[PDB]
């Protein structure tokens, strides 16, 4: 499917609830802030995103703790959660998504298979999140995996 | 020129003066961190990037003044120096690369034609800027930043 043409219809729901949403991405270095840049009316709902694409990064910019890093690693249901609560207080917005994975092609040193990535969507303090593992090259899992965070968004904002 | 390509050759400088990157986008979304995630040993130069596409978040994670943004705009000189030093001190990097344009199909409010770009390298709280108008459709003025804002890099790696 199209980035462009699902994140339009996403963003005009964000907008049609008046909600804001901020960014914190990892493998997917900056290309779901700049699905929502390229929409027609991005500031009407989003204006923040960042790439923290190491462990210190993470630290620094979001305040994900030493321990929950040195216990669980950056690609987990807890670092995800940890960078979706930073980024949303960060940025003062609605809704966080944070993603965290491995793009490939190598995979995790824990064995994570190449193609792993977690997800966290933050409304308001309110967390859900999901593991998936795409196929295909390293671009194409950064693909997927940024349609996945806005296809999710779009069926999570009707539930909320 | 080929985005990919010439990366990986300016990618191969910062790593043999063993200096760090860090970045601060708006118009051009997070693809230029996306260029920079993209190459096989990010980690070796690059691990933080911010998208502040919005006055209200320049001036929350970069600590952009706001008269500069009153006085200026945020595509200015003033504006992209001033988000090159917040990036640079939040992010603990050697060099940040800042950059400000409108990319279309609007121009500026203030009748800045659609793809006027400034641009700031700041290494080590020396800064050089550059003003740029591209030619081309908001995608193509997006990929033409990105693709300046390494190539030029690459030339002031050298000078520095």
């Given at each position: 499917?199209?980035?462009?043409?699902?994140?339009?219809?996403?963003?005009?729901?964000?907008?049609?609830?008046?909600?804001?949403?901020t960014?914190?991405?990892?493998?997917?270095?900056?290309?779901?802030?700049?699905?929502?840049?390229?929409?027609?009316?991005?500031?009407?709902?989003?204006?923040?995103?960042?790439?923290?694409?190491?462990?210190?990064?993470?630290?620094?910019?979001?305040?994900?703790?030493?321990?929950?890093?040195?216990?669980?690693?950056?690609?987990?249901?807890?670092?995800?959660?940890?960078?979706?609560?930073g980024?949303l207080?960060?940025?003062?917005?609605?809704?966080?998504?944070?993603?965290?994975?491995?793009?490939?092609?190598?995979?995790?040193?824990?064995?994570?298979?190449?193609?792993?990535?977690?997800?966290?969507?933050?409304?308001?303090?309110?967390?859900?999140?999901?593991?998936?593992?795409?196929?295909?090259?390293?671009?194409?899992?950064?693909?997927?995996?940024?349609?996945?965070?806005?296809?999710?968004?779009?069926?999570?904002?009707?539930?909320?």
């Open positions: 499917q199209n980035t462009h043409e699902l994140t339009t219809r996403v963003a005009r729901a964000l907008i049609a609830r008046g909600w804001r949403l960014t914190a991405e990892s493998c997917t270095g900056g290309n779901l802030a700049a699905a929502l840049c390229a929409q027609a009316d991005t500031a009407a709902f989003y204006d923040t995103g960042v790439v923290t694409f190491s462990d210190e990064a993470k630290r620094n910019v979001l305040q994900v703790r030493a321990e929950t890093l040195a216990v669980h690693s950056a690609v987990s249901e807890a670092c995800v959660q940890e960078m979706s609560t980024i207080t960060l940025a003062g917005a609605d809704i966080a998504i944070a993603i965290s994975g491995y793009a490939g092609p190598e995979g995790g040193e824990d064995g994570t298979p190449a193609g792993t990535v977690w997800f966290a969507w933050n409304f308001r303090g309110q967390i859900e999140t999901q593991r998936m593992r795409f196929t295909g090259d390293c671009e194409a899992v950064v693909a997927q995996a940024v349609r996945f965070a806005m296809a999710a968004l779009g069926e999570k904002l009707a539930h909320w």
